[PDB]
Amino acid sequence: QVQLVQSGAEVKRPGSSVKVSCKASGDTFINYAFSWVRQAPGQGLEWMGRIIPILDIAHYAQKFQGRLTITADKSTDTAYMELTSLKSDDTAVYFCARVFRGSQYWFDPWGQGTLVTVSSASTKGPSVFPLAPSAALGCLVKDYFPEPVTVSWNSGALTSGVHTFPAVLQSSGLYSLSSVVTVTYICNVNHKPSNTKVDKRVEP
Amino acid sequence: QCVNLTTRTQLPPAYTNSFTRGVYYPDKVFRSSVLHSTQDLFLPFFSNVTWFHAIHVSGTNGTKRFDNPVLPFNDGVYFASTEKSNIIRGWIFGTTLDSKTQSLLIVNNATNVVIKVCEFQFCNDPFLGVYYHKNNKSWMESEFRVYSSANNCTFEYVSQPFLMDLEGKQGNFKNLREFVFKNIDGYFKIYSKHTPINLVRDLPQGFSALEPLVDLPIGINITRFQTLLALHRSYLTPGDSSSGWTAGAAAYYVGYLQPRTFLLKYNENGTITDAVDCALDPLSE
Amino acid sequence: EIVLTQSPGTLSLSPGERATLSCRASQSINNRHLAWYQQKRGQAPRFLIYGAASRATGIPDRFSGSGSGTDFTLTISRLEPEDFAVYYCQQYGSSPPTFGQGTKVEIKRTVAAPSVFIFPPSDEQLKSGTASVVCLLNNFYPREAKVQWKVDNALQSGNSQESVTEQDSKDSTYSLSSTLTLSKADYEKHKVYACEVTHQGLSSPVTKSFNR
Amino acid sequence: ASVYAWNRKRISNCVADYSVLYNSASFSTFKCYGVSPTKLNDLCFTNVYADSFVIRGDEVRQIAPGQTGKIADYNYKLPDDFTGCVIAWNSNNLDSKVGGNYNYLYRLFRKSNLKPFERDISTEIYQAGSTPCNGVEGFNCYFPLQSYGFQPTNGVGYQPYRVVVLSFELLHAPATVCGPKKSTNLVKNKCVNFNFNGLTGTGVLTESNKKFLPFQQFGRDIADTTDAVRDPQTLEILDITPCSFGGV
Ligand SMILES: *[C@@H]1O[C@H](CO)[C@@H](O)[C@H](O)[C@H]1NC(C)=O
Ligand SMILES: *[C@@H]1O[C@H](CO)[C@@H](O)[C@H](O)[C@H]1NC(C)=O
Ligand SMILES: *[C@@H]1O[C@H](CO)[C@@H](O)[C@H](O)[C@H]1NC(C)=O
Ligand SMILES: *[C@@H]1O[C@H](CO)[C@@H](O)[C@H](O)[C@H]1NC(C)=O
Ligand SMILES: *[C@@H]1O[C@H](CO)[C@@H](O)[C@H](O)[C@H]1NC(C)=O
C-alpha cells in the first residue's frame, strides 16, 4: 500500500520513555488506521495498540494496557507510539503498519523498524583484541557498547569470505563482534559513533 | 451499597392523638379579624395517628427499635419530628421505588439540603448514619445508604452549605419540626413550623399554624413514601454494618389527611390562632 | 484463536517442492480468517494471502492457500530461489490478533568437516582477564551442533560452549565461534586446548592445537 | 458535536428569553416550524431541548419536517409535527482549519430509515453487498462514518454551519420554561388599572401601613374583596382604593 517510513534507532537506557514516528505517504490518513507490533529477537509478533485517526480512539492489548500511550498526528499524517517505563524486556523491533477500519484487520503494508534497546551504560569505543597466532587472520572485537560496528580486512584487499557474527548481549557495555576471514593485511575495524583505528597487526 | 439492616427488636406499634395540630394556611391571602371557612385537606381534630419511635435500651436485651417502613400516601401526611439529636433527616417519596419511575428525594445532611427528583434505586432499608471517632473528637458522616444508582434527574435544589450540630445530647426532646405534605394539581406543597418543646413523649396540646415553605415544580405520580433516619454508630457497637449501629432516640407522628371544612380565626397580623373542626362535635358544628 | 503453534520447524531440505506451514490452533478458527506474511533477513514483512483463498495485490500466483477448518496449510508450488524467508500467520477471526513462529526455508549443503582455527591470546589481552581462544566451525550445513573442547579432563563449560549466532550464507553454511571467556589464572593451569564439535559429519575434526 | 453524535441538553425551571436570538441580526436561518417566529415569549412550556450539530451550507435545508438526503434521513430525523424552531448561522471563521478540518464527522451508509429523535453512535461495518462483512473492510464493505474535510477555500455550500435545533414540549407536568414577564412604573394616587400576577382590576393605588407576613402576596376584606396587595419587585404593601364613582 502506502510507503511507510519510520524513525531511526533510538538507543536509550532503562528509565527513559521514547516515541516512534511513522509518516504516511500515498493516499490520505483520515481514511485508514495505523497499528503497531513489536518483534523481539527470538520472540514473536505481539499486537500492542491500534488507533483510529478518524474516530480519535485507540485500543490496547491485555499485557500492554496502561504502560503504553499511542497517539496520532492528523496534521502531517504521522502516528506516534509512546511507551512509558521501558523495561529491559522491551528490546524488540517495532514495526509500523496500516490497517482497515473495523473490528478485524490485517497488516498489508509494513514500515522500517526501530531499535530502542535499553542498555545504555557508557560510550566505550571498540577494543580489537590482538589475537596472537598459534594461526590464521583473526581479530576479536569486544568491549564496546554501540552495536553498529563496521568490520573489514584491508578495505577489500583481504575481505573475502568474511562471515559476520552478531554480538551477544553481555552484562553492560560489552558486545562480542567476532570476525575471522578464511585463510599491510590488518583487520580494518571501525565504529559508527566514534571512528577509532584500533586495527591490530597480528598476522602469522 | 444496599446493606440489609438486621438485629432489630420487633414489637407492635402504638397510637396517639393529634390534639388540634396540622392546621396550615389554606391560601396566600391576608385577612384580619375574620372567620373564613375553607374546604381544603386538613387533619381532623383528635385523630388517631400512628406513633413510631426509635430507641436503644442498654439492658440485657433492651429494645433495638428502628422504625422506617413504607407508608401509603393517600392525600396528605402530617409529619412530626420530636427529637433531640437530629435523627430524622428527610423522606423518600415515590410510586414503586424500584428505579422504574420518578421519585422525590429530600435529604438534610450536615452540609446542606439536597432536594432532587430522580429515579433512584432505593434499597430495602434506606437510612443515614454517622460514626463517632474517639481519636478525633468530632461527629463526621459514615455512610450514605439512601440509594445505590442514579438515572437522569429533572430537578435540583441544592441549597447553601452550612454546618449542623450532630451531637448526642441526652434529656427531653427539644426540637419539634412539623411537616405537612400535599399534592394538589401537581404542585407538591410543603409546610413547616418549628416550635420549642420540653417533653419526652405524648405530644402536648396546642395550636400551630404551619407556614408555606416551598412550591416545587413537581407532579410526578406519588403514592407511597418512607422515612430516612440516622443511626449514631458509636464505638460500643462492634461487628458488621448490620449490627454495629445505635438507634439513638427519636419519634415521629405520621398522620393521614382527608377532606374537611375548617373555620380559621385570623388575628390582626394575619396569623391563625385557633380553628373549628365543624365535624367532630355539634358544638363545633 | 489464541495460539498459532507452527507444525514445521525447518524446510531447508530442498527448494523444489511445495510447503505446509501448518498453523494449528486450540480453538476453532472463523470463516477462513487467516493472513500469511513473509519476512526475509529480519526486515519489513510483506502481505501474502488474505482469507486463505484469495491472492494479495502484487503477489504472483506462485503461492496457494488451503484449509477451511482449523488445520490451515500453505502450499507453494514450484518453490523459487526468492522464497527463502519466514512465513508467519495471523488469525484475525478472534478479538486479539495473534501471530505464530514461522519456518526458515533455505537450501541444503553437505556435512564436510569444519575448520579448527585457533587464536591464542597475546600478552595485551591475557592480563586483561580475557584469555580468548576463538574457534569457528566453518562450512557446516546443519544448525544442530554441540561445541566441545579438550580442556584438561574431557572439556569445559561456558568458555568452551559459547555457540555464537551463526548467520546463513549463500551456500547454506554456518560458523559458530566458541571464545574462551575465562580468566588468565585458569588459562595457564589447563592442558593443550583442542577445538572440535559434536556433529554427524565428523566428531573430531581437530587439526590445530595450542599447549598451555 | 458531530452530526451522528448530536448531544442534546434539556433546560427547565428557568425564565428563558428568545428575543436575544430572533432580534440578533447574526443568525443565517430562523425558520420556526409550527410556532410563529414572534409571540414566543408568551408560551410557557414544560421542558425544552437544544440539539447541536455542525453541517454544511447545502445541508441546512434538509433540517425541516419532511426531507430527503444523507443527513435528513441517515443522520438526523426531524419529526413530522415539529413545534420548536431551527437556528443556524455561518461558522466558517472558527470551525474550518487550514489544511483540512477532520473533526466533524457524518454517517453515509446505513441499513434502514432512522426514527425521529434517534442517536445511533454504532460503528459497525455496514454490508453494501449481499455477503456478510463480519467486520473487515476491503471486500466491497463500506464504513458508515465519513469525514467532512472542511476547508476555508471552498464555496458557500461547503462551509461549516452550526445548527441549534430548539425543541418544544408541553407535557402533563406543570410548565416550567416560561416567558419574560415585563413590568412598568409604579403609578400611585391615580385611577388606573393594575395587572399583578393573580389580581387584575382597577382602582387607586395608595400607601398602606399594614404589615403582611413574609410569605403572602395580597389580601382581601371581610366580604372577599381585595383591598391591599404587595408589590412584586419591592417588598412594599400598597392599598388599593376603589376609584371614585357615583350618580348624577
Ligand atoms: C386508636 O387509638 C388507640 C389509642 O391507644 C389505639 O389503641 C388504637 O389502636 C387506635 N385505633 C383504633 C382503630 O382504635
Ligand atoms: C430519562 O428520564 C425518563 C423519565 O422517566 C426515562 O423514561 C428515560 O429512560 C431516561 N433516560 C435514560 C437514558 O435513562
Ligand atoms: C398513580 O399510581 C397509582 C398506583 O400506583 C394509580 O392507582 C394512579 O391511578 C396513578 N395516578 C396517575 C395520575 O397516574
Ligand atoms: C402584631 O403586630 C404588631 C406590630 O407589627 C405587634 O405589636 C403585635 O404584638 C403583633 N401581635 C401579635 C399577637 O404578635
Ligand atoms: C428587584 O430589582 C429592584 C431594582 O433593581 C430592587 O430594588 C428590588 O429589591 C429587586 N427585588 C428582588 C426581589 O430582587
Side-chain angles (χ1 to χ4, degrees), chain A, chain B, chain C residues 1-203 205-212, chain D residues 1-181 183-206 208-235 237-248:
Chain A
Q1 294 290 342
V2 301
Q3 306 294 148
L4 292 175
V5 291
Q6 303 183 199
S7 301
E10 300 179 358
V11 182
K12 298 300 180 180
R13 53 96 59 180
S16 60
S17 180
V18 294
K19 45 183 300 299
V20 184
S21 301
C22 177
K23 294 297 180 299
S25 300
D27 51 68
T28 61
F29 178 71
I30 327 292
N31 193 25
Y32 307 101
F34 285 178
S35 180
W36 292 93
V37 287
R38 59 168 55 183
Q39 200 283 331
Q43 300 292 341
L45 287 78
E46 239 292 337
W47 178 83
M48 301 173 302
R50 187 261 301 185
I51 181 178
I52 308 179
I54 178 179
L55 299 182
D56 297 327
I57 60 180
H59 301 270
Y60 297 94
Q62 297 293 338
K63 59 186 304 300
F64 294 104
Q65 181 180 180
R67 206 183 65 178
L68 278 70
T69 303
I70 166 179
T71 58
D73 180 71
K74 300 181 300 300
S75 60
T76 60
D77 306 334
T78 312
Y80 294 154
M81 181 193 57
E82 195 274 344
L83 302 87
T84 61
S85 180
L86 291 181
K87 300 180 180 300
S88 180
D89 57 77
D90 299 330
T91 301
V93 189
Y94 294 85
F95 292 92
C96 180
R98 152 190 164 186
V99 305
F100 295 91
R101 300 175 299 180
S103 179
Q104 310 296 341
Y105 47 86
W106 57 86
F107 311 95
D108 199 329
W110 289 90
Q112 180 181 359
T114 302
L115 298 179
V116 295
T117 163
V118 277
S119 60
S120 180
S122 296
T123 56
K124 185 182 184 303
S127 300
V128 175
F129 292 157
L131 301 179
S134 300
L137 299 320
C139 296
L140 179 56
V141 186
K142 288 186 58 59
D143 300 336
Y144 75 93
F145 159 73
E147 179 70 290
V149 163
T150 301
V151 290
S152 58
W153 285 85
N154 202 14
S155 300
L158 200 60
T159 303
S160 60
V162 184
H163 197 290
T164 59
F165 301 144
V168 184
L169 180 60
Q170 300 291 340
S171 180
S172 60
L174 306 180
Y175 275 145
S176 301
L177 214 293
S178 50
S179 180
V180 175
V181 56
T182 60
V183 60
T184 173
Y185 290 158
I186 56 179
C187 46
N188 299 19
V189 180
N190 301 271
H191 202 196
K192 185 261 300 180
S194 60
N195 299 266
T196 307
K197 305 301 179 180
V198 287
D199 306 332
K200 301 300 180 300
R201 179 248 178 267
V202 291
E203 53 178 354
Chain B
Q1 47 81 210
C2 290
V3 43
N4 195 330
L5 200 63
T6 59
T7 318
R8 184 182 303 179
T9 301
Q10 299 293 150
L11 56 148
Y15 297 91
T16 55
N17 299 270
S18 60
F19 304 99
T20 68
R21 290 182 174 269
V23 183
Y24 54 89
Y25 290 85
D27 49 0
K28 320 298 295 301
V29 187
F30 184 88
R31 274 159 296 189
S32 300
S33 300
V34 84
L35 293 83
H36 181 261
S37 180
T38 183
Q39 220 291 301
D40 300 330
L41 310 181
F42 291 95
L43 184 63
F45 290 164
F46 301 92
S47 180
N48 204 333
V49 297
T50 314
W51 181 20
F52 299 92
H53 52 69
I55 59 180
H56 180 62
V57 188
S58 301
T60 60
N61 180 268
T63 304
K64 214 175 192 303
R65 178 83 284 183
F66 190 85
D67 287 328
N68 50 329
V70 46
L71 304 180
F73 176 80
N74 301 329
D75 300 76
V77 166
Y78 169 79
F79 186 89
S81 301
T82 60
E83 60 179 356
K84 62 178 180 60
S85 58
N86 300 120
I87 299 300
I88 169 65
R89 297 182 180 181
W91 314 264
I92 36 180
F93 299 87
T95 299
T96 61
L97 305 180
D98 299 326
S99 180
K100 56 97 79 284
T101 180
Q102 256 70 206
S103 300
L104 173 59
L105 179 64
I106 302 178
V107 290
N108 179 22
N109 57 89
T111 63
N112 58 89
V113 182
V114 183
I115 303 179
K116 48 173 56 180
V117 181
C118 216
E119 297 182 351
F120 311 99
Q121 179 62 268
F122 306 96
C123 306
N124 60 90
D125 197 329
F127 56 88
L128 285 313
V130 297
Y131 189 87
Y132 173 78
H133 296 67
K134 188 177 182 179
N135 50 330
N136 51 272
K137 306 298 296 299
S138 60
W139 290 85
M140 300 179 180
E141 299 290 339
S142 61
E143 298 179 2
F144 185 84
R145 314 293 88 175
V146 177
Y147 57 91
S148 60
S149 60
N151 297 122
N152 50 351
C153 314
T154 60
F155 186 80
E156 291 291 339
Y157 201 1
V158 179
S159 299
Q160 302 292 338
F162 53 87
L163 180 60
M164 299 181 59
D165 200 355
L166 271 63
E167 64 174 359
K169 49 180 174 58
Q170 300 293 338
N172 303 20
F173 291 163
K174 60 182 61 60
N175 297 327
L176 173 57
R177 309 176 185 270
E178 303 177 359
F179 289 97
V180 172
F181 302 95
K182 298 178 54 180
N183 181 271
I184 296 184
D185 287 68
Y187 292 91
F188 184 89
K189 303 179 181 60
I190 298 179
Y191 302 89
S192 180
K193 181 60 181 300
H194 181 272
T195 58
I197 188 180
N198 197 263
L199 294 181
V200 181
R201 34 83 279 269
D202 297 0
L203 187 63
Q205 310 180 180
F207 191 87
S208 180
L210 292 85
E211 303 179 0
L213 181 60
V214 79
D215 196 4
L216 299 169
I218 25 189
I220 58 178
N221 194 16
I222 302 179
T223 313
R224 297 161 57 181
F225 76 103
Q226 208 178 0
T227 304
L228 297 180
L229 297 179
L231 25 78
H232 296 175
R233 302 182 62 179
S234 300
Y235 59 92
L236 33 69
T237 55
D240 52 73
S241 180
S242 300
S243 60
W245 58 276
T246 301
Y252 48 96
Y253 298 87
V254 173
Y256 294 149
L257 302 183
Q258 66 178 197
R260 225 169 183 90
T261 299
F262 282 79
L263 181 68
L264 312 93
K265 176 191 298 180
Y266 290 88
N267 201 20
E268 60 180 0
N269 298 329
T271 169
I272 314 173
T273 61
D274 203 331
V276 176
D277 193 8
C278 209
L280 179 61
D281 54 79
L283 180 61
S284 300
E285 295 181 3
Chain C
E1 296 183 359
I2 200 60
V3 76
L4 287 178
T5 55
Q6 209 74 21
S7 180
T10 163
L11 260 55
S12 60
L13 14 76
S14 180
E17 34 69 282
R18 38 87 278 179
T20 300
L21 275 305
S22 181
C23 292
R24 307 193 314 267
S26 181
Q27 300 181 2
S28 59
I29 321 294
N30 296 22
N31 302 90
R32 308 187 68 176
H33 290 359
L34 183 60
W36 305 85
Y37 291 95
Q38 177 180 0
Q39 178 239 205
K40 183 183 303 300
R41 287 300 186 92
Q43 289 290 154
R46 60 199 65 176
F47 199 87
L48 185 61
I49 293 293
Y50 57 93
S54 180
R55 317 299 172 88
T57 60
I59 297 299
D61 297 0
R62 309 177 298 101
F63 302 88
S64 180
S66 179
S68 60
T70 177
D71 197 334
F72 290 90
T73 175
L74 178 64
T75 60
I76 312 177
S77 60
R78 200 59 56 184
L79 206 284
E80 293 84 5
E82 191 272 344
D83 298 326
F84 278 157
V86 185
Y87 298 91
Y88 281 86
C89 265
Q90 178 195 6
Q91 41 179 3
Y92 56 91
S94 60
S95 180
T98 60
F99 290 84
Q101 304 294 337
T103 302
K104 192 68 179 65
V105 181
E106 293 179 359
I107 347 94
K108 195 177 183 60
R109 190 54 184 178
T110 58
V111 295
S115 60
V116 208
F117 296 119
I118 294 299
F119 305 95
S122 180
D123 55 323
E124 292 80 15
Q125 47 177 151
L126 181 61
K127 299 184 299 299
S128 300
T130 60
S132 301
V133 181
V134 183
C135 178
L136 64 158
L137 290 313
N138 199 333
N139 299 120
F140 78 115
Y141 162 74
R143 282 189 171 94
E144 179 182 0
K146 296 177 297 300
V147 187
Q148 54 177 178
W149 279 71
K150 283 294 185 300
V151 190
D152 180 71
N153 299 121
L155 72 162
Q156 247 294 130
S157 60
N159 60 89
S160 62
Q161 277 73 209
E162 183 69 20
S163 180
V164 81
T165 300
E166 8 76 29
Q167 300 180 357
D168 56 329
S169 59
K170 26 73 180 179
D171 39 48
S172 182
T173 54
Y174 305 89
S175 50
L176 21 74
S177 300
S178 60
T179 168
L180 274 65
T181 60
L182 37 73
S183 60
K184 59 179 180 300
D186 298 70
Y187 189 80
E188 283 74 9
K189 195 181 299 181
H190 305 144
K191 293 302 176 299
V192 49
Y193 302 93
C195 178
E196 55 176 5
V197 58
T198 301
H199 198 72
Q200 54 271 172
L202 186 52
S203 300
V206 46
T207 62
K208 301 181 181 61
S209 60
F210 181 83
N211 185 269
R212 191 62 58 89
Chain D
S2 300
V3 196
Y4 72 100
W6 50 279
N7 302 329
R8 62 168 55 182
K9 184 257 299 181
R10 55 175 299 273
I11 35 180
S12 61
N13 319 280
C14 72
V15 183
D17 54 84
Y18 305 94
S19 60
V20 302
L21 303 178
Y22 183 81
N23 300 270
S24 179
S26 299
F27 299 147
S28 300
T29 60
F30 212 92
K31 304 301 179 300
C32 294
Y33 306 94
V35 298
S36 61
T38 59
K39 296 299 180 300
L40 25 65
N41 287 12
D42 299 330
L43 300 180
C44 195
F45 297 97
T46 302
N47 58 90
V48 301
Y49 301 92
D51 305 332
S52 300
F53 53 90
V54 181
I55 56 183
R56 302 197 307 265
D58 296 356
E59 298 180 349
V60 186
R61 303 91 181 269
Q62 299 184 3
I63 308 301
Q67 262 294 150
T68 171
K70 59 183 62 60
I71 303 297
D73 298 67
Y74 295 154
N75 292 263
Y76 187 85
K77 271 290 301 179
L78 199 65
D80 181 70
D81 300 331
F82 187 71
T83 178
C85 185
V86 181
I87 300 178
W89 67 93
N90 181 270
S91 60
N92 182 270
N93 55 275
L94 75 166
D95 293 359
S96 62
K97 182 182 300 180
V98 181
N101 182 22
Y102 4 87
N103 300 270
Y104 295 153
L105 310 180
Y106 70 111
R107 182 163 52 185
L108 274 173
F109 304 94
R110 275 193 53 88
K111 58 188 62 179
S112 60
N113 183 86
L114 194 60
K115 299 176 299 301
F117 294 156
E118 285 288 342
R119 180 188 299 102
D120 294 337
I121 59 180
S122 60
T123 58
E124 60 270 343
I125 300 181
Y126 168 74
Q127 42 179 1
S130 60
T131 171
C133 296
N134 203 19
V136 290
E137 187 178 1
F139 297 145
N140 201 90
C141 303
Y142 297 151
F143 197 86
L145 297 182
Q146 195 68 208
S147 180
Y148 262 141
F150 290 152
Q151 182 72 205
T153 61
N154 281 329
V156 66
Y158 296 91
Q159 292 181 359
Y161 276 82
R162 294 177 173 180
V163 183
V164 180
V165 180
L166 298 180
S167 300
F168 295 155
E169 180 181 2
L170 211 171
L171 206 60
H172 301 71
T176 63
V177 180
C178 248
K181 303 177 180 300
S183 301
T184 58
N185 300 120
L186 181 59
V187 177
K188 301 178 60 60
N189 300 329
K190 279 184 293 299
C191 182
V192 294
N193 315 279
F194 45 84
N195 193 18
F196 291 102
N197 301 86
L199 185 64
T200 301
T202 179
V204 179
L205 301 180
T206 57
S208 180
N209 59 273
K210 304 178 61 179
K211 300 300 180 300
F212 299 161
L213 298 181
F215 61 87
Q216 300 172 344
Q217 302 293 337
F218 57 94
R220 294 187 295 265
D221 294 354
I222 312 298
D224 299 70
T225 58
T226 308
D227 188 71
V229 299
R230 175 183 295 183
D231 191 74
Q233 295 185 355
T234 176
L235 300 181
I237 287 85
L238 286 76
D239 197 332
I240 299 185
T241 300
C243 175
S244 60
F245 67 99
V248 181

